[PDB]
Amino acid sequence: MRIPLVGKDSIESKDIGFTLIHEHLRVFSEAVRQQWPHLYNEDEELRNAVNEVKRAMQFGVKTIVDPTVMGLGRDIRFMEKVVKATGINLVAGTGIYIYIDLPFYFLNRSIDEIADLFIHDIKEGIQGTLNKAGFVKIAADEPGITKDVEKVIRAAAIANKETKVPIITHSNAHNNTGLEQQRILTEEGVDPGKILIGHLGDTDNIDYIKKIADKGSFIGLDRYGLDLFLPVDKRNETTLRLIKDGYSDKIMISHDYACTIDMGTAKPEYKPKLAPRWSTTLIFEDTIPFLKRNGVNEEVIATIFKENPKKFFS
Amino acid sequence: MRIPLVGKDSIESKDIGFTLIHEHLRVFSEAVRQQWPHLYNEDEELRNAVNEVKRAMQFGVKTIVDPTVMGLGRDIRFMEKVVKATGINLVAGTGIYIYIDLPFYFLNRSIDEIADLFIHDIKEGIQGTLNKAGFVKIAADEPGITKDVEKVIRAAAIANKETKVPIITHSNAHNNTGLEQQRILTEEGVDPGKILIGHLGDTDNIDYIKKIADKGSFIGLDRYGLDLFLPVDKRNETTLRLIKDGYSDKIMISHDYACTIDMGTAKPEYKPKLAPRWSTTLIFEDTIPFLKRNGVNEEVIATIFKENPKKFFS
Ligand SMILES: [Co+2]
Ligand SMILES: [Co+2]
Ligand SMILES: [Fe+2]
Ligand SMILES: [Fe+2]
């Protein structure tokens, strides 16, 4: 009715239920998998995603929002198979994930041409299917807001204005890329309440995080388990502080888990050190119980995982 | 034997015949094509490649070397189809084409892991087929020798020392990247005679061009027709001067034509302005006749287009 779902009829935002706002079923580099397929195994990848999703559902997760887009190996037909096997509500997205420059395809191409690609995914469908994009994903990281990064941001604003789908971002918590994404998007006419600034939970700099929330956007405390960015304990402490300071209606929580990911950083012998407890269920095992025994009312849990995602997609 | 060909038994390097050392059957950004297939037309692309190759063969071209690798949309099965329809000898390669950073896949991966990918293509086959790579292609441009660019250059050296296949490079004629590529490769123990420093025809600075030939590598006067980089008549005067100065033993000539290319810069609109006479038969129409009118004999032409490619692959 409003939010398109992979392999399902669209639904009203009020029916989204308990939601994980940022989780990846599978991530890979398009060019590498295309050039060297021997490196990948789809059977395992599907099995890994299906199993992970089933664990999440057993904890009550009703909807998963998967911001895998161009540059992370979005594959709508893979996503269909996971839904087919699990029955999860899956929201797919459109957009471009870059840190520095766009692919050469985009040389001498306008921001409008880029926005047109996103709009195609939202109105027509993804990768030749009738599965439609429910949001736009954009990124910026250590390199900052480069020329191409900015062009992609402004294209996302155009797509939002045309289709009203919200925007999810990837940012670096330590260099103000998040605040800049927000500024540019809102200058382009995007409603601040239609923006989730991502990976802000990677820092304990509470003052910076509040600055984005005060400007009306959702803040992504969304990498629970990725200790190399910030340990779980510190994340919980920051989350609790924000809630106590009255920021629960701006907070969104997730793991940014990748059921399978091809980056060398994700090698098995690195897990114990970088992300020992990383998964899509960590928050049920740690974060939520922690909050409840620290004076946080159930109503606040309901706000973060149900109400906020609802408003976001409304 | 010696040189592996797409869709054919390998051949002796002595039987390579008249060769175009740098031409592309098709170029595209892997990620863009994968995410937005609606932008592309396989049937038209095949038609374009087939017809162009046939025109080259009518002018005596026996072998085409196609340096389309990761980052340029290498597709071995598409290459097979063109071979079947034309009968051309086609040499495919392996390697990586980047200007700044490697794909995220390579985060926390060694230069050895990279080399292993090249050696896989050379020894086992490309993209799950039995078509083997006959050379390694690497690149550097305006941004210069970045850390990741340098990593790829060294992996190419490993692949060459292991398998003996030659290396073809892409460089920017104005920033010393070509000379730097040659230095790094030779320091790694690569035979200079197994290196083609590419795109040197983009400049008329013969002092710089000669510096590379003097160190033992082939020089790529390889973008005939691409006037936006350097107009035909200027390339001709440079080519002629080099021959007159005795450098025909290091000279290689080609067009770097792309029968189909998805970059905005290559739109049909811009062709008349940026590269009006660009194609795989330009050197037969203009360059070769021009050299002959200026006293260059048949032997020199045979040296450039038959003998040099032979040495390169020996
Ligand atoms: Co991210
Ligand atoms: Co090139
Ligand atoms: Fe993510
Ligand atoms: Fe080329």
Residue numbers in the entry:
A (entry chain B), B (entry chain A): 1 to 314
Please give sentences taken from the publication describing this entry.
Phosphotriesterase-like Lactonases (PLLs) are appealing candidates, being natural lactonases endowed with promiscuous phosphotriesterase activity. PTEs and PLLs belong to the amidohydrolase superfamily, and share the same (β/α)8 barrel topology. SsoPox exhibits high acyl-homoserine lactones and oxo-lactones hydrolysis abilities, and promiscuous, low phosphotriesterase activity. SsoPox is a very appealing candidate for the bioremediation of phosphotriesters because of its unique thermal stability, and its ability to resist aging, solvent and protease treatments.
Of them, the most active variants, αsA1 (C258L-I261F-W263A), αsA6 (F46L-C258A-W263M-I280T), αsB5 (V27A-I76T-Y97W-Y99F-L130P-L226V), αsC6 (L72I-Y99F-I122L-L228M-F229S-W263L), and αsD6 (V27A-Y97W-L228M-W263M) were subject to kinetic and structural characterization. Although the active sites of the improved variant structures superpose well onto the wt-structure, all selected mutants display altered loop 8 conformations. Notably, mutant αsA6 was crystallized in two different conformations: one in which loop 8 adopts a wt-like conformation, referred to as closed conformation (CC), and another one where loop 8 is unfolded, referred to as open conformation (OC). Interestingly, variants αsA6 and αsC6 exhibit enhanced lactonase activity against γ- and δ-lactones, while αsA1, αsB5 and αsD6 show reduced lactonase catalytic efficiencies. This emphasizes the fact that the improvement of the phosphotriesterase activity does not necessarily compromise the cognate, lactonase activity of the enzyme.
